[PDB]
Amino acid sequence: AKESTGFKPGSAKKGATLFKTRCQQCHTIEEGGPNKVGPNLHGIFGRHSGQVKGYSYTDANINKNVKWDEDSMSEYLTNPKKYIPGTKMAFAGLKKEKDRNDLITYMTKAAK
């Protein structure tokens, strides 16, 4: 629910730091970075869920076929399991809206 989301741009600075303290443990975002616990996120926005080559996803994520946009990412980050029952991503999610906007700001930039 994109509209619902109505995602607003935030602090890319801020996003940068939430990435490190929260997604870096398991993911890279750099162009040409490798998979790790989670898959490399470079190019995420221009792609559906479950397609980075050489990464083994759950049927759940593959089947989910999400077209990752910022409204999409926003739901998913509040509760990944909730957005994708069966996913193996282990993280409670980002509950504050502000948090998610900052992050997605960075992501949107870093991942391009």
Residues found near a copy of itself in the complex (CB under 8 A): 1-2, 7, 67, 69-72
> How far apart, in whole angstroms, are the C-alpha atoms of residue 64 and residue 33?
24
Please identify, using beta-carbon distances, which residue of 25 and 63 lies nearer to a copy of itself.
63
Residue 44 sits in the site that holds ligand HEC (CB under 6 A) = yes
Please identify, using beta-carbon distances, which residue of 67 and 109 lies nearer to a copy of itself.
67
> What dihedral do alpha carbons 68, 73, 74, 76 form, nearest 10°?
120
Distance set, CA 21 to CA 1, 15, 79, 106 (Å): 27, 10, 18, 13
- Burial class of 65 by CB neighbour count within 10 A (0 to 12, 13 to 18, 19+): exposed
At 62, list the tokens: 């593959």
Q: Which of residues 46-105 bind ligand HEC (CB under 6 A)?
A: 49-50, 52, 57-58, 60-61, 87-91
Q: Which does 2 bind (CB under 5 to 8 A by kind): ligand HEC, a copy of itself, none?
A: a copy of itself
Q: Give the residue numbers of the binding site.
A: 23, 26-27, 89
Residues that bind ligand HEC in the complex, under the rule CB under 6 A: 22-23, 25-27, 37-39, 44, 49-50, 52, 57-58, 60-61, 87-91
Known binding-site residue numbers for heme c: 23, 26-27, 89
